[model samples]
Target: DLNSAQVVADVLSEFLEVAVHLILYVREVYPVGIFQKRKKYNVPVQMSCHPELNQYIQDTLHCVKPLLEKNDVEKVVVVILDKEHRPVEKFVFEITQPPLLSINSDSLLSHVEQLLRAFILKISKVDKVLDHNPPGCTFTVLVHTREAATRNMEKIQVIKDFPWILADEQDVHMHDPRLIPLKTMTSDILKMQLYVEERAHKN
Candidate 1:
């Protein structure tokens, strides 16, 4: 069963904290790559791995591992992709907390959707580019499945509410939601925040 909106919000808030910390860590370490001639920006620059991103991933896993163990989350997968939406790599962590709770497909999809929405919202507020560019760059989120026969019908259903997002070819079998562009996600989140702030100021 799906959690109530408030419960979902609370859980999302926690995940957002983790996501923000990870993003900040990446920014501090990797910085943004600038194309001198084209004035284009790139992240997780090619040719070499960013030390900060690597360290942050390691640290996050370490911290989350204990929590997963406590909660008895059998497996947690984190997928990282580049600007083009190509899979750079994936991280899978398993835990044995005993008597793992059974998570239904619908519930899992709902949680993932809520987490992504919260992440975009939080990122829009603190990301400097949101003030200037107003939307910033586009990044991809690749959700990968290890099983060959398993299908991602539930994930597909969850993402249906967001028309702007789609699944990449590689993830077609898994039916993962491939967000079209980070700009779209960032812009929508910023708009919502600005609207609320404006309303609060007026009142």
Candidate 2:
């Protein structure tokens, strides 16, 4: 597997940790009790130590392992949902180009980490550019995949493995969707672009 599995796992873990932390402080995804202050890139950040939340992210990542190994992941979205479980905002990580993995890439990971730090900082100040989003919102990690990824798999084979939903694309919007590109990162194996999309409040 050329350890693509490990790289995928590592990237997912890193991305999710940074993302959830940023969301906690930015969007108030949870009570403040679950988060504690930390530092990354020489700036303060919010880190979640809640056991349940940690396990939840782990479980989700576990479900994603197989897909990563197969290079099936196309886009991953951290969706903020209203009480009805409808998407209110989306933080998207789109796979612009699949990474070209290889051995002896220690220096590359450091570069990736540095870029991630900058991305995290950008996320920390995201509130400045965006309007007030609703408070009672919970979030879900939505993974979108290539149609060809499953084109050859048995229906039950895929059904038994992946925990994601084939959600309807239609979503009701209160106003025009606004998009902000956060940053981009590339490991030897994949390239990803992060963006934030917000739906304005309905008066």
Candidate 3:
């Protein structure tokens, strides 16, 4: 329920805590120097610990929490860019809220825990199937929503600033993208699917 913040964080943290690392690593957003590996869910996964990158993820996801309250966010995308800044790959974390469950809190958490373990196991499988990307790539976050522009009292700004062209604009790209669909994980309320689009780079 929206009334439970700590409980909410526990579920959100389950994925953000590990999912961010796995996404970054799979996309090569940063090299080895930037990540720290921690063993959890029966495997050692590398998570970014570099102050700047960690803070960036912290800042991004914490903002996502408030959007959850209003049911405004649709999906959060992580985009990888080429040297010229064209999007080459994207990791989509689709979000949706489900009807509240009447189960006991502990029971709900236990089930979320089971799903989290399976999700991490899925993260480890990315490199096993996906090919490498071209060099000189970077990444950023973009949000898709139904009424998120109405979010956080930015409604007025959106009324004037929202671009009508956004809906018709061509996808910013430099190459054809290859998509890889990964497993999905759901909590009592939020459902997240992870997918990657690898931009085919022509040398």
Top candidate (lDDT): 2
After the best TM-score superposition of candidate 3, give how far the Cα of residue 125 lies from its true spot, in angstroms: 2.4
* Runs in model 3 lying further than 4 Å from the true structure: 1-10, 101-103, 148-176
Ranking by lDDT: 2, 3, 1
Best by TM-score: 2
lDDT string, candidate 1, 1-203, tens digits: 22233232344334433443344333332344511111101112121145654444444344433233234233343443334444333222222222333344465545455435653443434334321211122222222233321343232232333322335564322233222223112221111111101001101
lDDT of 2 by residue, 71-96 (tens): 66777778888776667778887864
lDDT of each: 0.32, 0.68, 0.65
Ranking by TM-score: 2, 3, 1
- Please state the error at residue 34 of candidate 1 in Å: 9.2
Superposed Cα deviation of residue 94, candidate 3 (Å): 1.5
lDDT: the better of candidates 1 and 3? 3
lDDT of 1: 0.32
> How does residue 137 of candidate 3 score in lDDT?
77
TM-score of each: 0.28, 0.80, 0.77
Q: Residue 160 error for model 2, in Å?
A: 9.6
**Which ranges of candidate 1 are over 4 A from the true structure?**
1-22, 25-30, 34-48, 71-101, 128-203
